[PDB]
């Protein structure tokens, strides 16, 4: 998808589109649930209620056509989950660097007598 503008504009346009798409899928689900609820009510009615049984089958046809045109909501991409925990415990002096000098052979010394704790 190609938008005109900057990163924020893309986020604004995108967030709205997924919101408007989400509301569409919600309303399609409500209508399916409504038909489903009536189909079940007819299914469990007495066999002697001919008209209700008839109407139940008629709505079963609409329910089938609905379920075949019902947009699937895209699975939201899952975000990373990190739980970093240390096995052992830190000391008051984890690392001691004292008077450390280093140079790559043939190049100026990067640091001289570097000491930190």
């Amino acid at each position: 998808s190609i938008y005109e503008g900057d990163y924020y504009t893309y986020k604004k346009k995108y967030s709205e589109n997924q919101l408007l798409r989400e509301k569409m899928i919600i309303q399609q689900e409500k209508e399916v649930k409504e038909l489903a609820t009536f189909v079940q009510k007819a299914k469990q009615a007495s066999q002697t209620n001919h008209a209700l049984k008839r109407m139940g089958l008629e709505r079963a046809i609409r329910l089938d056509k609905k379920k075949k045109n019902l947009t699937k909501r895209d699975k939201v991409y899952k975000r990373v989950k990190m739980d970093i925990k240390p096995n052992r415990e830190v000391a008051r002096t984890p690392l001691k660097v004292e008077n450390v000098t280093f140079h790559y052979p043939g190049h100026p010394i990067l640091y001289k007598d570097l000491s930190f704790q």
């Binding site: 990373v80 990190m82 240390p86 830190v90 690392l95 990067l110 930190f116």
Partner: protein, 65 residues
């Protein structure tokens, strides 16, 4: 050494937030201003002029100088 490199912006924030809660010592290098803020640096070591310093918005002063 530059952990947030190559990571998408969403994953960077997740990385920084979880490190902030890490119960251990962290020696980090990062040119990303957002990542260092999330981790909440304590002491900064400036190079090449060795300067073990308390972390602060004075980081900008070293960058300027």
């Amino acid at each position: 050494d530059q952990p947030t490199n190559h990571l998408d912006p969403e994953t960077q924030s997740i990385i920084g937030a979880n490190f902030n809660l890490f119960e251990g010592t962290i020696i980090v290098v990062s040119h990303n201003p957002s990542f260092v803020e999330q981790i909440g640096i304590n002491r900064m070591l400036i190079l090449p002029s060795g300067n073990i310093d308390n972390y602060s918005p004075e980081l900008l002063e070293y960058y300027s100088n």
